[PDB]
C-alpha cells in the first residue's frame, strides 16, 4: 500500500498475460 494503487489506470493490465492471449486466440 505504497504508491501502488495511488495511480490506478490499467486497462492493458498484465501485459505478460495480454500477450498470453493476444494472438493465441487467433
Amino acid at each position, epitope marked *: 500500500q505504497d*504508491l*501502488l494503487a495511488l495511480d490506478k489506470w490499467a486497462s492493458l493490465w*498484465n501485459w505478460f498475460d495480454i*500477450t*498470453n492471449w*493476444l494472438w493465441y486466440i*487467433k
Partner: antibody
Framework: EVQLVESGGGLVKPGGSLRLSCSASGFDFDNAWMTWVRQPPGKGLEWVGRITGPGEGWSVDYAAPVEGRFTISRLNSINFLYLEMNNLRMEDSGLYFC??????????????????????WGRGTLVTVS | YELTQETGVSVALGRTVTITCRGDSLRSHYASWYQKKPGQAPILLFYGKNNRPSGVPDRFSGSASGNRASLTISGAQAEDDAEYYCSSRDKSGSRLSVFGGGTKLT
C-alpha cells in the same frame, strides 16, 4: 531528451554488497518499465533483469547467473530505478547499464511474450570487485 | 550463448555486406540488434524483427534470415563500423530477454 544518469558502485571485496541508482527524466516513468544489463570489461553486454510495468504485475525477472543475487526496485515518485546487488562473486563487474525497456508485439508473427527493445540508455557507471 | 553470435567481420569502406547471429528462440520470437561503439552509449539498430527506430543510420539495411538474424550495412563508414550486438528471448515463452553478445564489424 530522456537523460538517464546512472551513478553508483565502486571497489568492494569479493563478498559484499552495494547499491546502484538510475535516475530518469524526460518521459513517463510511471508505466514504462526499465531494465538493467551488465557488460563485464572483457566481454559484451549481458542481460541482468527488468522491472515489469506498474499494472503489468510490478514484478521482476532476474537472469540465469544473477538469479538469487540482485534485486530491482523503482520509486516512481522520484523517477528512480534502484538495483541492490548483494552476495557478490568475482565475475560481477563492468559498466552496468540502465535502459528503458519497451513493449513490442504484432499479429501475424505473434508469440508471447513477444520481444522488447532498449532504446534510451544511460551513460554508464563502472563497478569493479576485488 | 543461447543466442549464439559471430566474433566479427571486416569492411571495405563502401560495402553492402551482412552480419549474422544465430539462436533458435528467435524463430519463435522477434529479433533485436544494437550498435555499441566502445566508450559510448549503445544504440538500437532494429526495433522488432521487421522495424527500425528513428535516428538509425540510413545506410543500414537488412532484417533477418530466420533464427540467424542477419542484417546488412551499406556505405561503410570507418568511424561507424565499431561493433554491433544481438539479443532476443532465451527460451520460447520466457521473459528472460538474454543479451546474446555481439560482432566486431571491424
Amino acid at each position: 531528451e530522456v537523460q538517464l544518469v546512472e551513478s553508483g558502485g565502486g571497489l568492494v571485496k569479493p563478498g559484499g554488497s552495494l547499491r546502484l541508482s538510475c535516475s530518469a527524466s524526460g518521459f513517463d516513468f510511471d508505466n514504462a518499465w526499465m531494465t538493467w544489463v551488465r557488460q563485464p570489461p572483457g566481454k559484451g553486454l549481458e542481460w541482468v533483469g527488468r522491472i515489469t510495468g506498474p499494472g503489468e504485475g510490478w514484478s521482476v525477472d532476474y537472469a540465469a547467473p544473477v538469479e538469487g543475487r540482485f534485486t530491482i526496485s523503482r520509486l516512481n515518485s522520484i523517477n528512480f530505478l534502484y538495483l541492490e546487488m548483494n552476495n557478490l562473486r568475482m565475475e560481477d563487474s563492468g559498466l552496468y547499464f540502465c535502459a528503458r525497456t519497451g513493449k513490442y508485439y504484432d499479429f501475424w508473427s505473434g508469440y508471447p511474450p513477444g520481444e522488447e527493445y532498449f532504446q534510451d540508455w544511460g551513460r554508464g557507471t563502472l563497478v569493479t570487485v576485488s | 550463448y543461447e543466442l549464439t553470435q559471430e566474433t566479427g567481420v571486416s569492411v571495405a569502406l563502401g560495402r553492402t555486406v551482412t552480419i549474422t547471429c544465430r539462436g533458435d528462440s528467435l524463430r519463435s520470437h522477434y529479433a533485436s540488434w544494437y550498435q555499441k561503439k566502445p566508450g559510448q552509449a549503445p544504440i538500437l539498430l532494429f526495433y522488432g524483427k521487421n522495424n527500425r527506430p528513428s535516428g538509425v543510420p540510413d545506410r543500414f539495411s537488412g532484417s533477418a534470415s530466420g533464427n540467424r538474424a542477419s542484417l546488412t550495412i551499406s556505405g561503410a563508414q570507418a568511424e561507424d563500423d565499431a561493433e554491433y550486438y544481438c539479443s532476443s528471448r532465451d527460451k520460447s515463452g520466457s521473459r528472460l530477454s538474454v543479451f546474446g553478445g555481439g560482432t566486431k564489424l571491424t
